[PDB]
Each structure stands twice: as C-alpha cells, then as structure tokens.
C-alpha cells in the first residue's frame, strides 16, 4: 500500500507561518477519499462534465496559518496583506481551499508570537511566490544597512494569537490543494 | 459591526492623580490596540500600540494593557501637560480599516478661582449697520460652571444672548467665557442701563458690571 | 525633518468635487501604508481610507464609490479625490503615515473641508473698547468682535504677534442668520492704555479678507 500522504499534511503537528508556507507534492500514490468537519471547503475551476475519465495531475498541497478573517483572501482575484505579500492564488486557479479553526492548538494565553506574516513589501507577490526575505525594510530614503530603527523595519509581524481573540482573529490552519484536471484512461 | 466604547466619556482629575481610561470592544477583537492623545486644535499623537508598547518618546507614566474585550490606558501620576481627548483604535481584519472609540476628555482639576468681569457696549461703527452687540467677558476662572444674567433697565433678558467658553488654559488651568447680547439699533436705543450679572462658585455674591448707553 | 502637510480643503457645494494633497517629507510615501482620517467638528475620529505599501486601496463604507486615494512617487505626495460631496463629509481631514499594528505615528496638521450651499462672506471687525472705569494700577480688558462671516475659520493676532500673554480667542458661535461671530480679548495693564497701541489682526482666508483694527478708549 502507498496511500497518498494527505494525513501527513492535514494532521501535521506544526504548521508554517504563512510567509514561509509549506508545499507538499502529492504524487505516485493512490488517494483515499475520506470526507463538514471543515469551516471552509471551496473549489475553483473544477468544471467537468465527464467524470468517468478524470485524472488529477500536478497535485500540490500548500499549508500555513492565518487569521480566520483572512481565509477569504485565499481565493482567486483577492487583495489584502495576505494575498498581496504572503500567499497569492492566480486568477485561473483550479483546486480547493480548506481551512479549520485551530485556536486550541495555535493560541497561547500569553499570546503566541511564533506565527508571523509579512507586513512590509514594496510590490505584490506573483501567484504561488514564496518570499522568505528577512531584510530590513527601507521605508525612507536613508539605507538601513541591516539595522532596525526609524524607517527601517523588520518586514514580518506577529499575529499574537490568544484564545480570547474574537473568532475572526483566531488562528486557522489552511490547506490549498492545486492540480490540473485531465481526461485520460488509467 | 465592531464598536469601541470608551469610559468614562469625560473626567476631571488633579495633578498627581492616577487616571485609567477603559476601552470596551463590543465583540472579540485582536490582541492589538492603539491609543492616541488629541490636544485641542492639534492632530492626534500616538502614545501606545500593541496594547502595551510605549511609543518612542512618550513618558513612562503612560501605560496600557488589556485582554479579551476590555483594554485600558493609564497615567500613573497626572502631570499638568496631560490634558486632552484620548482615543483607542483597533485595526480590523475584514473589512480592512480602523475603528475608533468615541473618545474620553480629560481636564485638570484645580483650586476655585473667581472670574474677572468686563462689559463692553456696542461700537459706533456697528450701530451704523442697525445692530448692537453687547459683550460680557468672564476672565480666568474655575470651575467651568458660571451663570451670566443680562439685565436691560433691570429686566432680565432671555433668548437674545449666546455664549462660548475657551478650552482649559495651559499656564493656569482656568476657563474664560464670553456672552453676546444682540439687539436691533432701534431696541438698543430704547433703554439706558445695560448690565451683566455673574454668578460663580468663587464669588461670595454675584458681581455686576454695567454701563449707561451714551455715557463716558 | 519628518512631516506631513495637507492642503486642498475649502468650501464646496453639495455634489461638488475636492482633491486633498498630503506632501510628505522624511519618508517615502510610495513605500508606506498611508491613511486618511477625518474629524467632523466637535466629533471623534473616523477612518476614511488607506493605501498599502504595494498599492491596494480600501475605503470606509460611508465614502465608498465617491472617494479615491492615490499617490505620486515623484512628488512624494498622497491624494484623496472626493466626488459627490454631502454635508456630512464636512470635517478636518488628516493624513497619516500608517504602521498598521504599530499605530499611525506621523500626522499632518489637517485641512478643513466645508460642504454647504451657503456662500462665502468676510467678517466685520468691531472694537471692544476698554472701559473708562478701568482701575489705575489694575487690569483692563479690550478686544475685537469679529462678526458675520462664513465659513470657519478666522484667525486673530494682536500687535502682529507681539502680544500673546492674556489673549483669549473664543470659539465662534453660529448665529440664527447662518453666519459666524466670535470675539478675541486681551487683559493688559490699565496704566498702559494711553501709551501702547493695541491692534487685532483678523484673517479670514476663505475670502482673502484681512483686517487690522486699532482698539483704543472711546473718545469722551
Ligand atoms: C487525521 O486524523 C484523524 C484521526 O483519526 C483521521 O480520522 C483522519 O482521517 C486523518 N486525516 C487524514 C487526511 O488521513
């Protein structure tokens, strides 16, 4: 048996910050469909009439943590701090976005400062781009020379998840399944 | 929608006192909240962000904290330079934007001070236009509350006066008040004694200043 | 020297358009989040709009579809285009460099926007003349009555700026005629009345009226 390792993705103990989102290739395996226990489940571009010769190819599973009210940004055609500077889906996205509340895993009563998102960036991400720079951001004319200070900012900001945050501000774990839908015999 | 309700709305407090302004959120928000100080006629000044982090340059007597829906700003020992209106601010995630609290006005308490009272007749220039403004001035007093009673040939006037009050002074923490009585030229010329009678906590009995139309 | 300087506000009829400018110095507009915040007279702060470092723009629901935020890199300037203005857009408009979770740290001084059908009118300036009854070595009061103008604001100075101590310039009041009136007063030594010259300098920029008025004891 070589069942596809989705359990490794959805059930991972730790999730990445969204600026450093993880990508898992799903390949050379047989998928165990196993399904509405999820607060978001949305698919895009999956438009097939014939269902008998369906083949999923180029399957990637991306995963990360964002705020409940940011999950709306993980969709084609959206804007915001997450879609502009952290995780960008393309207009023609084909695949599904899956999310669930993880307040009891990813919040801490003192505030969890381990989860971050990129706050400063001079231009938008391209689709499926991952920016992990920690270069000090130059918000002025004077160079920073890697020293923080006025107009010289660490580009990442903490979410500070706390269990008493409003539900829209609580951490959500997100899995983005992207693929191409081809028509082919097995 | 999310609302930030500050309390109290207004507050008088003496130098050296401990002041605590609350911001209550109508629903759960994030861990982040900011506080601004707006002095009259000036742009807001940032004091605290991230609920408790002091903005660079802000004096240590300012502090903030909070959790859940109830957040506070605190001045440990009120200095006189700390009069203002105070606003809390939350950066919302969807729709992106800011909510402000309605604000809390903080004024300084001080010793009672009686007003100095001056009355001014209408000018000959203004009277050629057919209107007479008579002005009563209450200068440098505390507390704010004061009664100005206009008298015209000893009849108490109601309904033809307007007043306005300055903001608290920076050098002495007093208020000043001005009240204007408006009459037509025709009506002005029908009476002789114009008087302004002032009642205030700092005066043992009311004080009256007057002039007789057309004298001196 | 880090500052924001707004301009472009003024009196405009309902339905008209205005364009506000915010000239920055000390940081790069095109690299920062920037917000517009407004304050209706005697009211609180209301957030209007911001633009992100990377160009996305967002608007409060009360200005959706009528306002547009934008910026010009080469002039280091932020703009707010305001169309279909309504009376309740009347406010002081502040621009601010926005650091998101780290607050709005740099503010401009504001530009005043008055949306109304009424027309501009410059003020008359009348003397509040010191009393003949003023006490010898005591304190006397005098001033200027700044009457019947639209819209706000007026500024008042004394002796071109040389006299500032003892000056009270009062909040204007709105009279039933729809026009504003205010008074500005000064307490000075009674013994100074015959010698030193007192002049209030009134300026009402919405109509380019300037008026000086010498305030002296009235004759007999
Ligand atoms: C994750 O663990 C639960 C616990 O039994 C299991 O039911 C679920 O199938 C797992 N997820 C996947 C994708 O296998």
Do A90 and A69 share a domain, yes or no?
Answer: yes
Token pair listed for B163: 């007043």
Q: Domain B4-108 classified CATH 1.20.1440.230?
A: no
* CA nearest neighbour of B139 among B166, B105, B111, B104: B166
Determination technique used: X-ray
Residues B167, B171, B176: CA angle, nearest 5 degrees = 35
Please answer whether residues A25 and A144 qualify as being in contact, where contact means their C-beta atoms are separated by less than 8 angstroms: no
Chain A partners (3+ C-beta pairs within 8 A):
B, C
Please answer whether residues A69 and A22 qualify as being in contact, where contact means their C-beta atoms are separated by less than 8 angstroms: no
* CA nearest neighbour of B36 among C59, A162, C3, C37: C37
Write the class of the CATH domain B116-212.
mainly beta
β-bridge partners, B53: B49
Of all atoms in ligand 1, which is nearest to the CA of residue A9? Answer: 13
User: What is the resolution in angstroms?
Assistant: 2.4
Q: Do domains C3-115 and C124-215 have the same CATH topology?
A: yes
- Domain coordinates in residue numbering, chain C: 3-115, 124-215
Token pair listed for A15: 């999730």
CB-based contact A138 C31, cutoff 8 Å:
yes
Q: Is A7 in the pocket of ligand 1 (CB under 6 A)?
A: yes
Q: How many C-beta atoms lie closer than 10 Å to residue A180's C-beta?
A: 12
Q: Which CATH topology does C124-215 take?
A: Immunoglobulin-like (2.60.40)
Do A4 and A69 share a domain, yes or no?
Answer: yes
**HSE-CB for B124 with a 13 A CA cutoff:** 8
The 3-state DSSP class for residue C79 equals strand
**Separation of CA A105 from chain center:** 17
Do A135 and A183 share a domain, yes or no?
Answer: no
Looking at the structure of chain A, the number of domains it has is 2
Token pair listed for B157: 């006037």
Do A76 and A98 share a domain, yes or no?
Answer: yes
Token pair listed for C105: 């740290």
Residue nearest to atom 1 of ligand 1 (CA): A11
Do A84 and A17 share a domain, yes or no?
Answer: yes
β-bridge partners, C124: C147
Q: Is A8 in the pocket of ligand 1 (CB under 6 A)?
A: no
- DSSP letter at B17 equals -
Q: Is the peptide bond before C106 cis (omega within 30 degrees of 0)?
A: no
Q: Is A6 in the pocket of ligand 1 (CB under 6 A)?
A: yes
| Architecture of the structural domain at C3-115 | Sandwich (2.60)
- Domain coordinates in residue numbering, chain B: 4-108, 116-212
Beta strands in chain A (DSSP E): 22-26, 40-44, 54-67, 95-101, 116-118, 137-138, 152-153, 156-158, 171-183
The partner residue sitting opposite A122, judged by closest CB among C26, C53, C99, is C53
Do A36 and A93 share a domain, yes or no?
Answer: yes
CA-to-CA separations, B67 to B3, B24, B32, in angstroms, rounded: 16, 10, 9
Do A171 and A154 share a domain, yes or no?
Answer: no
Contacts of B116 in chain C (CB under 8 A): 139, 141, 187
Do A74 and A152 share a domain, yes or no?
Answer: no
The 3-state DSSP class for residue A83 equals helix
Token pair listed for C16: 């008209």
CB-based contact C220 B180, cutoff 8 Å:
no
């Amino acid at each position: 048996t070589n069942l596809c390792p989705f359990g490794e993705v959805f059930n991972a103990t730790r999730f990445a910050s969204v600026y450093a989102w993880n990508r898992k290739r799903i390949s050379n395996c047989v998928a165990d469909y196993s399904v509405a226990s999820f607060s978001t489940f949305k698919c895009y571009g999956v438009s097939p009439t014939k269902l008998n010769d369906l083949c999923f190819t180029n399957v990637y599973a991306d995963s990360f943590v964002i705020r409940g009210d940011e999950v709306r940004q993980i969709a084609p055609g959206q804007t915001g701090k997450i879609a502009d500077y952290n995780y960008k889906l393309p207009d023609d996205f084909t695949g599904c976005v899956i999310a669930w509340n993880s307040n009891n895993l990813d919040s801490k009563v003192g505030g969890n400062y381990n989860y971050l998102y990129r706050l400063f960036r001079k231009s938008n991400l391209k689709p499926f781009e991952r920016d992990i720079s920690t270069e000090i951001y130059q918000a002025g004319s004077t160079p920073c020379n890697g020293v923080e200070g006025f107009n010289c900012y660490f580009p990442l900001q903490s979410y500070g998840f706390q269990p008493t945050n409003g539900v829209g501000y609580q951490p959500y774990r997100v899995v983005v399944l992207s693929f191409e839908l081809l028509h082919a015999p097995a | 929608d999310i609302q930030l309700t500050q309390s109290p709305s207004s507050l008088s407090a003496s130098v050296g006192d401990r002041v605590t302004i609350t911001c209550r959120a109508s629903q759960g928000i994030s861990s982040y909240l900011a506080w601004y100080q707006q002095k009259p006629g000036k742009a807001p000044k940032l004091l605290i962000y991230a609920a408790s982090t002091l903005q660079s340059g802000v004096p240590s007597r300012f502090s903030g904290s909070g959790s859940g829906t109830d957040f506070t700003l605190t001045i440990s020992s009120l200095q006189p330079e700390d009069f203002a209106t105070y606003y809390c601010q939350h950066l919302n995630s969807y729709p992106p934007g800011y909510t402000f609290g309605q604000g809390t006005k903080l004024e300084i308490k001080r010793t009672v001070a009686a007003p100095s009272v001056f009355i001014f007749p209408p000018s000959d220039e203004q009277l050629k236009s057919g209107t007479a403004s008579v002005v009563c001035l209450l200068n440098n007093f505390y507390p704010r509350e004061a009664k100005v009673q206009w008298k015209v040939d000893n009849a108490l006037q109601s309904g033809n006066s307007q007043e306005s009050v300055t903001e608290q002074d920076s050098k002495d923490s007093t208020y000043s008040l001005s009240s204007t009585l408006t009459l037509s030229k025709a009506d002005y010329e029908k009476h002789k004694v114009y008087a302004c009678e002032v009642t205030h906590q700092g005066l043992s009995s009311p004080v009256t200043k007057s002039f007789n139309r057309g004298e001196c | 020297e880090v500052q924001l300087v707004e301009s472009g506000g003024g009196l405009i009829q309902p339905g008209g358009s205005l364009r506000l400018s915010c000239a920055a110095s000390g940081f790069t507009v095109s690299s920062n989040y920037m917000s517009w915040v407004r304050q209706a007279p005697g009211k609180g702060l209301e957030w209007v709009s911001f633009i992100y470092s990377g160009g996305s723009t967002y608007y409060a629901d009360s200005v959706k579809g009528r306002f547009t935020i934008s910026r010009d890199n080469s002039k280091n300037t932020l703009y707010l285009q305001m169309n279909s203005l309504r009376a309740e857009d009347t406010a002081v408009y502040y621009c601010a460099r926005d650091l998101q979770e780290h607050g709005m740290d740099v503010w401009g001084q504001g530009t005043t926007v008055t949306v109304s059908s009424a027309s501009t009118k410059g003020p008359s300036v009348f003397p509040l003349a010191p009393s003949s009854k003023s006490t010898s070595g005591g304190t006397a009061a005098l001033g200027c009555l700044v009457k019947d103008y639209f819209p706000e604001p007026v500024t008042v100075s004394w002796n071109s700026g040389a006299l500032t101590s003892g000056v009270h310039t009062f909040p204007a009041v709105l009279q039933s005629s729809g026009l504003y009136s205010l008074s500005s007063v000064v307490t000075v030594p009674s013994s100074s009345l015959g010698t030193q010259t007192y002049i209030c300098n009134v300026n009402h920029k919405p109509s380019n009226t300037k008026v000086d008025k010498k305030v002296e004891p009235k004759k007999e």
